[PDB]
Amino acid sequence: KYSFKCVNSLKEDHNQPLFGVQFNWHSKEGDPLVFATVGSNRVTLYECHSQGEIRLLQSYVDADADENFYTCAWTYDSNTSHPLLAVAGSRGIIRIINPITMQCIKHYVGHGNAINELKFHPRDPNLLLSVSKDHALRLWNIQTDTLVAIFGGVEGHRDEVLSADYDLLGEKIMSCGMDHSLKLWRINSKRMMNAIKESYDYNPNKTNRPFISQKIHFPDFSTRDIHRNYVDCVRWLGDLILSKSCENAIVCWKPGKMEDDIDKIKPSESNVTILGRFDYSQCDIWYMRFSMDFWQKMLALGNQVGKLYVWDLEVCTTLTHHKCGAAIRQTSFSRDSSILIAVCDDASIWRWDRL
Ligand SMILES: COc1ccc(F)c(C[C@@H]2CCc3c(C(C)C)nc(N)n3C2)c1
């Protein structure tokens, strides 16, 4: 059903892989569609214009040349509506950047180990989730600069956490990593809702107390039975999960037996139910993300030879350009799903417009 035309492409002059791309879904009405790209020590902003024009807006060039940005996530200021961009990578430093000036206005350091993904809470623009090479997830309140919670320990991830996703309402997180496992962490518990509330009440200039972070050691569910390799991308599709490894499939599955409710699932739940698989080829290298559009009506995944697969989630289109031959690391749909951006290993950017 869905068709796209390649209207433009470009290459960033650093020639390093671009690991992340995100459209700003908080962009204002009347303003051009903006997306950010991340790779090497750079964060770059582009505007989408008519006649397929991809206009370079601005760039952040990190002071440390050895920084490798792996992820970016947009949010907005809850009082003014002004957009902000969160970036992080190999250095383990979260940077909150003002996109108008490219000023780093806030930075956070957990233990300083590489951050593989950032995600903002779907209902709270101040709640930032980070997943790290150090096997833990961290939840930050960027309004009060507090570490709300650390998810991990011997019962948490036993290797790098590579991806995570909040559900629709931001009541729970599903995480995944190098340990082959997918873990559930409920954040609508009395303990977590209280912690989030206290994070808002914290002001270090009016007290001598440190802000106490929750140490969440036990996940609400765990499975190692979906994939047989590094699980590098996870996303909620309602109460269901979409996840992939490097085994040439995106698996749609759920914790428990076929008719088990996600909110009745106990931590000891030993079963999983696979609902289906999105099969494809030549996407067996590690660290390849899939994306969905805002409405979760489309699913897109680039492969390691520059093909871009798009599935209709309501019922497969293959987007290919004879000059697009590098690994597509991540894709991003604009909020209205009219544009799909693919970023590559060779620092190239490809613009596909929906017909
Ligand atoms: C684009 O798709 C991603 C999926 C998952 C994911 F974690 C990332 C970010 C990094 C990409 C690079 C990286 C390495 C290098 C040193 C070999 N090693 C780890 N662990 N990474 C992860 C990206």
UniProtKB/Swiss-Prot annotation:
PTMs per UniProt: Methylated. Binding to histone H1 'Lys-26' promotes mono-, di-, and trimethylation of internal lysines.
N6,N6,N6-trimethyllysine found at: K119, K190, K206
Stimuli inducing this protein: Expression is induced by E2F1, E2F2 and E2F3.
Residues with PTM N6,N6-dimethyllysine: K119, K190, K206
UniProt-reported outcome of changing W286L: Abolishes binding to H3K27me3
Compartment(s): Nucleus; Chromosome
WD repeats mapped onto the chain: 13-56, 64-107, 110-150, 156-197, 226-263, 281-315, 323-355
Shown residues in whole-protein numbering: 79 to 440 of 441
Protein name: Polycomb protein EED
Tissues and organs where the protein is expressed, per its UniProt entry: Expressed in brain, colon, heart, kidney, liver, lung, muscle, ovary, peripheral blood leukocytes, pancreas, placenta, prostate, spleen, small intestine, testis, thymus and uterus. Appears to be overexpressed in breast and colon cancer.
Species this chain originates from: Homo sapiens
Residues modified as N6-methyllysine: K119, K190, K206
Required for interaction with the matrix protein MA of HIV-1 as annotated region, ranges: 71-225, 223-355
Transmembrane portions of the chain: none
Disease as annotated in the protein's UniProt record: Cohen-Gibson syndrome: An autosomal dominant overgrowth disorder characterized by accelerated osseous maturation, advanced bone age, skeletal abnormalities including flaring of the metaphyses of the long bones, large hands with long fingers and camptodactyly, scoliosis, cervical spine anomalies, dysmorphic facial features, and variable intellectual disability.
Subunit architecture: Component of the PRC2/EED-EZH2 complex, which includes EED, EZH2, SUZ12, RBBP4 and RBBP7 and possibly AEBP2. The minimum components required for methyltransferase activity of the PRC2/EED-EZH2 complex are EED, EZH2 and SUZ12. Component of the PRC2/EED-EZH1 complex, which includes EED, EZH1, SUZ12, RBBP4 and AEBP2. The PRC2 complex may also interact with DNMT1, DNMT3A, DNMT3B and PHF1 via the EZH2 subunit and with SIRT1 via the SUZ12 subunit. Interacts with HDAC, HDAC2, histone H1 and YY1. May interact with ITGA4, ITGAE and ITGB7. Interacts with CDYL. Interacts with BMAL1. (Microbial infection) May interact with the MA protein of HIV-1.
Domain notes: The WD repeat domain mediates recognition of trimethylated histone peptides at the consensus sequence Ala-Arg-Lys-Ser. This is achieved through an aromatic cage encircling the methyllysine, and involving Phe-19, Tyr-70 and Tyr-287.
Result, substituting Y70A: Abolishes binding to H3K27me3
One term of GO molecular function: enzyme activator activity
